[PDB]
């Protein structure tokens, strides 16, 4: 149904196409690493969605 993502470590991003928000709960990633680059992006309650480092999270679908 809906592919979703979850976080474990409130780690910060670096790349310019990323987003720096206090991660803690679950988010939904639209960009997958199967067709798109190794980076993914999900929307936060911040109104902005950047590229979140999977190395600092765990997907939850």
From Swiss-Prot:
Residues 3-61 form the SH3 domain. Ubiquitous. Phosphorylated. It is found in: Cytoplasm; Endoplasmic reticulum. It comes from the Eukaryota. Adapter protein which associates with tyrosine-phosphorylated growth factor receptors or their cellular substrates. Maintains low levels of EIF2S1 phosphorylation by promoting its dephosphorylation by PP1. Plays a role in ELK1-dependent transcriptional activation in response to activated Ras signaling. Interacts with DOCK1, LIMS1 and TGFB1I1. Part of a complex containing PPP1R15B, PP1 and NCK2. Interacts with FASLG. Interacts with AXL. Interacts with PAK1, PKN2 and SOS1. Interacts (via SH2 domain) with EGFR. Interacts (via SH2 domain) with DDR1. Interacts with IRS1. This is Cytoplasmic protein NCK2. The gene is NCK2.
């Amino acid at each position: 149904g809906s592919h979703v993502v979850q976080t474990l470590y409130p780690f910060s991003s670096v790349t310019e196409e990323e987003l720096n928000f206090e991660k803690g709960e679950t988010m939904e990633v639209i960009e997958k690493p199967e067709n798109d680059p190794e980076w993914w992006k999900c929307k936060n309650a911040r109104g902005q969605v950047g590229l979140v480092p999977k190395n600092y999270v765990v997907v939850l679908s």
